[PDB]
Design a protein around this ligand. Structure first.
Ligand SMILES: CC(C)CCC[C@@H](C)[C@H]1CC[C@H]2[C@@H]3CC=C4C[C@@H](O)CC[C@]4(C)[C@H]3CC[C@]12C
Ligand SMILES: CC(C)CCC[C@@H](C)[C@H]1CC[C@H]2[C@@H]3CC=C4C[C@@H](O)CC[C@]4(C)[C@H]3CC[C@]12C
Ligand SMILES: CC(C)CCC[C@@H](C)[C@H]1CC[C@H]2[C@@H]3CC=C4C[C@@H](O)CC[C@]4(C)[C@H]3CC[C@]12C
Ligand SMILES: CC(C)CCC[C@@H](C)[C@H]1CC[C@H]2[C@@H]3CC=C4C[C@@H](O)CC[C@]4(C)[C@H]3CC[C@]12C
Ligand SMILES: CCCCCCCCCCCCCCCC(=O)O
Ligand SMILES: CCCCCCCCCCCCCCCC(=O)O
Ligand SMILES: CCCCCCCCCCCCCCCC(=O)O
Ligand SMILES: CCCCCCCCCCCCCCCC(=O)O
Ligand SMILES: CCCCCCCCCCCCCCCC(=O)O
Ligand SMILES: CCCCCCCCCCCCCCCC(=O)O
Ligand SMILES: CCCCCCCCCCCCCCCC(=O)O
Ligand SMILES: CCCCCCCCCCCCCCCC(=O)O
Ligand SMILES: CCCCCCCCCCCCCCCC(=O)O
Ligand SMILES: CCCCCCCCCCCCCCCC(=O)O
Ligand SMILES: CCCCCCCCCCCCCCCC(=O)O
Ligand SMILES: CCCCCCCCCCCCCCCC(=O)O
Ligand SMILES: CCCCCCCCCCCCCCCC(=O)O
Ligand SMILES: CCCCCCCCCCCCCCCC(=O)O
Ligand SMILES: CCCCCCCCCCCCCCCC(=O)O
Ligand SMILES: CCCCCCCCCCCCCCCC(=O)O
Lengths: 504, 504
């Protein structure tokens, strides 16, 4: 089998060039800038995207070295002879895999810990050095009460003038954009329930003026609730070398998810794309990983996940068999993805690659973590993909893309949570596998690993993640005070008050 | 069997009097006061307690009438001949039970809707008419940073003076009680993350000065985290007519749960008792309902709940058989509970009956809802219990109890959530039972009932429940402004600043 896999790779390389030819009928410039240049020139989303690649390179450089030089010779010309499945049942060499599963997990968790601190330092620093933006001082208020004898405008200003008299500026219009004097003031309007009735006078931080999903305002509350039901139904209906054809059809799914999320009741394109990103993560895990591992009907797969006590064995006995599939998958989707982006085949639309690429990076990471333990020969393919991606994307972000919004580093929590999922899924597989390999002690001793990993995640959920949703009082106050001395707020406020005028 | 059940009731009545005799070796006065007198004289917790009884009386007066005059004759001298189990398999009379399950559920949900509105009206009104209390303006800050060259006191005042300069008053002491000028000010300190690091400068509204669990402050953060692990372990270890003996041992469980919760890291006796209340709800559901229904070992019961697709049949086939058990249980625990309280056998300690009685009321409600559908003859026993309870407790709250704290109506969310659980469990049983009774159409059509019930619950979770955790800006501001005209805040503040002095 190894020579067939190498042949497949050669075929895919040949296809790459044939497609470039049909279409027609940089490294130093990408790598030299440092991360501080990325934060100043592109911003936090670009920086997180790059750090996701760095994280993956570190995770898999480690995994590749251990996988290839320590575990691979234990496991060991078919691909299978290099997998854990070639280890004798009951073997004490499985304790090497056991140590590796805790060390690898500890390393991944350590790397996540590091990235959380790194990214937050950059995020707090970004706030302190940046200029004030209209979206930082503006709240979108919705569910404005219908008051006889009064317009929506009158209802909104009376509410905010009465309850936020020290911070209210002005507003524009059953919803309105309300401006505040300070970031802290806006935080209060969005963090503390406003009216007696919590389902009205709803507050959310405003998106950028240029990122407002203006069609949002067309629908009434009932009308948009009806549409979000339709979106969910359509999403589920969507969920429920010829492999190239498969990949080519996957290339149109992101557009589907975006148009689908656009009618779900979001107020911004950032939310629509983030929502589509999440739908793609769900979609890819279901339609690529579980669909190929748990081969069968959609009903069969659903029934598998209704019986938790058997999941470890269903996956431990199903996943290893797909290692050769996934090498092909990664190579095909790898070059399809990278060539598609270089040649701009998608618009031939999101202003950034995040919606479509974060799910590719993360899906590959799922396979990397899962197969480090089970079949290490996948790891060098993933490592090459990530290294090429890193070079290519540093160039594409600097010279090709033109983001129409900034979301701080709000994609980072996706990466964290998805990574914990990848580790936990792998741990579940390992528990099941040590069971199948007749090493029940390891199977039992590995139960605490998912638990500690989840507790680690919870620690991070309480310790780091809240700062990606909002900034704390200490931070916002220090900046509001700095702005009072450093920024010309008397002009900022004149822009702020008309920033959200509907440009029509 | 019916004559044996009547004999058992007669025996229990005889035992009641024998026990009163050994111990020794009002209705108009309880019922005449209205709910406004309860709110003014006893407060919101007493009012909620009474409304829980009113809710149960209305739920079971309805259920008793339908159960006894509509379903009972359909079902129909053993007790079993009056149960749903006596209905022919495949019978169209099961559509009566089917209609009754939706009507009953709609009625219970309607009654919950009503109570949520009623209770909140009383809660908002209570806030507007009451005098300011020290606990409304005080925040307990914990996780105060260790700063070289500075005391904890210095660290706390510098943080609040710098970030809450418009509202800070004073504080007393790795934790401190910090006072604010307004309720809104305190709300900001407790609702918005304070420091950069969310695990430090933690803020929580202070409990009453007389309700502070002072031992809390003895432990360091690590030391109390160690203890809460011990509490969980001890709790689980506790979880894992001779029926009187059983009930008598259950009477010591509340003391165990209270001492157990006292070392878990709570800051007040209100939290300890509420925590114990929750542990008792968990304990009773596990050790009384599931232990008797799912007869077997603890491991067996745990395994039952690891297979969701079979739960409906395991319970549908197990619960109906216990109807005679539960009639005896309700009668025995009913008189044991009421006589124990009248004679003060528990102190021969909580200042109120809430910790111990809310779980009795709610457990009985679980049985009422479950057996309305399956065996209606239980319902009159529950109805008598609730009616006697209502009379007895109105008297005990007015003349016997002396609460050492006020928690608003914070027990109400327990009642809501527990009630939704009771309805959902009953719906699960009904789905399983219509399956067992060969009426698969009803089994299928009942699936939406748990779903709508849960969506109703979610609606209430967003619509009503947040107001039981805190008051909204509109409410707090209207009151802070009223206090500026109506209350002598210049004296309140002098009491506020020393209110939490450790009385030692
Ligand atoms: C059998 C298949 C369908 C299982 C997949 C479901 C679970 C295990 C995975 C798939 C993708 C994941 C999500 C991706 C993005 C986000 C946004 C963040 O703000 C909170 C967590 C959250 C919401 C993740 C939690 C867990 C998740 C929902
Ligand atoms: C077998 C398949 C379906 C995987 C197992 C699913 C369960 C047991 C595990 C795997 C990883 C876990 C998640 C890891 C990260 C986060 C982010 C936070 O915002 C909420 C909790 C949340 C979302 C966890 C919930 C439970 C979780 C989804
Ligand atoms: C098989 C047995 C162990 C099942 C029992 C577990 C579930 C179904 C029940 C038992 C008691 C219930 C709880 C009682 C009190 C409260 C406090 C409130 O602020 C939020 C909900 C919450 C936390 C309830 C949610 C559901 C609950 C946890
Ligand atoms: C068979 C036994 C174990 C019962 C079934 C358990 C599940 C499916 C259901 C029954 C009732 C439900 C609960 C009803 C009320 C609340 C209060 C809110 O604060 C959080 C959600 C929460 C806590 C729900 C979560 C899920 C729930 C616990
Ligand atoms: C198993 C032990 C060996 C471990 C070897 C680890 C090597 C890691 C190399 C990571 C290089 C990442 C460079 C990122 C540069 C950047 O910050 O953009
Ligand atoms: C197990 C065999 C492989 C050994 C490990 C090889 C590590 C290769 C990755 C080095 C970091 C490259 C970072 C990307 C930018 C670049 O190409 O310079
Ligand atoms: C293998 C299961 C456990 C997973 C969790 C491992 C987490 C390890 C990282 C946390 C310790 C970080 C210590 C940093 C100290 C410093 O600041 O120098
Ligand atoms: C028996 C089948 C098991 C699989 C069930 C999968 C359920 C996943 C539901 C989506 C959870 C993520 C919610 C996203 C919230 C958001 O938009 O930020
Ligand atoms: C065997 C199947 C089990 C499936 C378990 C699915 C668990 C879904 C968890 C949803 C998490 C949603 C978190 C949102 C947090 C946020 O709002 O930021
Ligand atoms: C307080 C936080 C607790 C977190 C617990 C997270 C548990 C996630 C599931 C991982 C363990 C699954 C093990 C199944 C073993 C089996 O039953 O065969
Ligand atoms: C039952 C034990 C669960 C432990 C799971 C790991 C949770 C993370 C522990 C903290 C790691 C960071 C240590 C440095 C703390 C500091 O100096 O701030
Ligand atoms: C088969 C899996 C079903 C899902 C149940 C297991 C997941 C339990 C939830 C764990 C995440 C808890 C997130 C809140 C953390 C916190 O307390 O701050
Ligand atoms: C099945 C249809 C018949 C329904 C009959 C319902 C009778 C309900 C009686 C409830 C009385 C509750 C009195 C409570 C007094 C109070 O507010 O304290
Ligand atoms: C199905 C047969 C029973 C018929 C319904 C009987 C209703 C009895 C409850 C009436 C409300 C009593 C309220 C408690 C205070 C009191 O006793 O006056
Ligand atoms: C049987 C499943 C559905 C359960 C949910 C039923 C909820 C019914 C109560 C909501 C409607 C209340 C209308 C009140 C109108 C008014 O204010 O007069
Ligand atoms: C397989 C066994 C199924 C039973 C699992 C029961 C888990 C119940 C855990 C307690 C949930 C309630 C949390 C209370 C939070 C609070 O203190 O307010
Ligand atoms: C078949 C077994 C299923 C068991 C499912 C248990 C679900 C537990 C839900 C816990 C709810 C905790 C809500 C706390 C809300 C709050 O903090 O106020
Ligand atoms: C958006 C909120 C969704 C709420 C969904 C709540 C579902 C709770 C479980 C009740 C239905 C259980 C039916 C099991 C039927 C079976 O599989 O045999
Ligand atoms: C898929 C449909 C789910 C419906 C579940 C019931 C949720 C409650 C609906 C609102 C009931 C109250 C109606 C009165 C509204 C008002 O006038 O304020
Ligand atoms: C076998 C049961 C396992 C538990 C999974 C079913 C319960 C799903 C959670 C439903 C409650 C959601 C509470 C949040 C409501 C909201 O969005 O505001």
């Amino acid at each position: 089998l190894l020579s067939a896999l190498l042949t497949s790779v050669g075929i895919n390389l040949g296809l790459c060039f044939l497609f470039f030819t049909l279409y027609s009928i940089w490294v130093k410039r990408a790598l030299e800038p440092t991360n501080d240049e990325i934060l100043s020139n592109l911003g936090l989303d670009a920086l997180v995207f790059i750090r996701v690649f760095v994280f993956s390179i570190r995770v898999f450089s480690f995994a590749s070295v251990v996988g290839i030089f320590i575990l691979l010779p234990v496991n060991y010309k078919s691909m299978d002879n290099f997998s854990i499945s070639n280890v004798n049942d009951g073997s004490n060499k499985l304790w090497i895999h056991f140590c590796a599963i805790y060390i690898f997990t500890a390393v991944v968790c350590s790397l996540l810990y590091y990235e959380h601190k790194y990214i937050l330092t950059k995020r707090i620093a970004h706030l302190y050095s940046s200029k004030p933006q209209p979206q930082e001082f503006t709240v979108l208020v919705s569910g404005v009460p219908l008051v006889s004898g009064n317009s929506i405008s009158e209802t909104v200003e009376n509410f905010f003038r009465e309850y936020h008299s020290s911070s209210y500026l002005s507003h524009i219009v059953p919803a309105a954009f309300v401006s505040f004097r300070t970031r802290h003031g806006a935080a209060i309007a969005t963090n503390i329930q406003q009216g007696i009735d919590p389902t009205q006078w709803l507050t959310e931080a405003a998106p950028e003026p240029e990122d407002v999903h203006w069609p949002f305002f067309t629908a009434s509350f009932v009308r948009r609730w009806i549409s979000n039901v339709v979106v969910l139904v359509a999403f589920v209906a969507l969920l429920i070398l010829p492999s190239l054809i498969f990949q080519l059809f996957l290339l149109i799914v992101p557009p589907i998810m975006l148009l689908l999320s656009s009618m779900q009741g979001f107020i911004s394109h950032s939310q629509i794309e983030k929502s589509a990103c999440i739908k793609l993560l769900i979609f890819t895990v279901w339609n690529s990983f579980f669909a190929n591992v748990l081969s069968g009907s959609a009903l069969y797969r659903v029934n598998v996940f209704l019986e938790p006590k058997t999941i470890p064995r269903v996956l431990a006995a199903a996943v290893p068999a797909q290692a050769s599939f996934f090498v092909s998958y990664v190579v095909t989707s790898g070059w399809t993805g990278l060539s598609s982006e270089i040649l701009r085949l998608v618009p031939l639309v999101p202003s950034t690659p995040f919606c479509q690429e974060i799910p590719r990076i993360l899906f590959f990471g799922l396979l990397g973590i899962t197969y480090f333990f089970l079949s290490p020969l996948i790891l060098p393919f993933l490592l090459v993909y990530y290294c090429l991606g890193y070079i290519i994307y540093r160039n594409q972000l600097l010279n090709v893309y033109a983001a129409k919004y900034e979301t701080g580093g709000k994609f980072w929590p996706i990466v964290h949570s998805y990574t914990i999922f990848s580790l936990v899924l792998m741990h579940i597989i390992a528990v099941g596998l040590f069971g199948l390999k007749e090493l029940p002690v390891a199977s039992s001793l590995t139960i605490p690993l998912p638990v500690l990993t989840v507790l680690f995640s919870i620690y991070c959920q309480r310790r780091f993640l809240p700062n990606f949703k909002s900034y704390p009082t200490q931070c916002l106050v220090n900046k509001d005070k700095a702005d009072e001395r450093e920024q010309n707020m008397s002009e900022f406020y004149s822009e702020l008050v008309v920033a959200y005028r509907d440009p029509a």
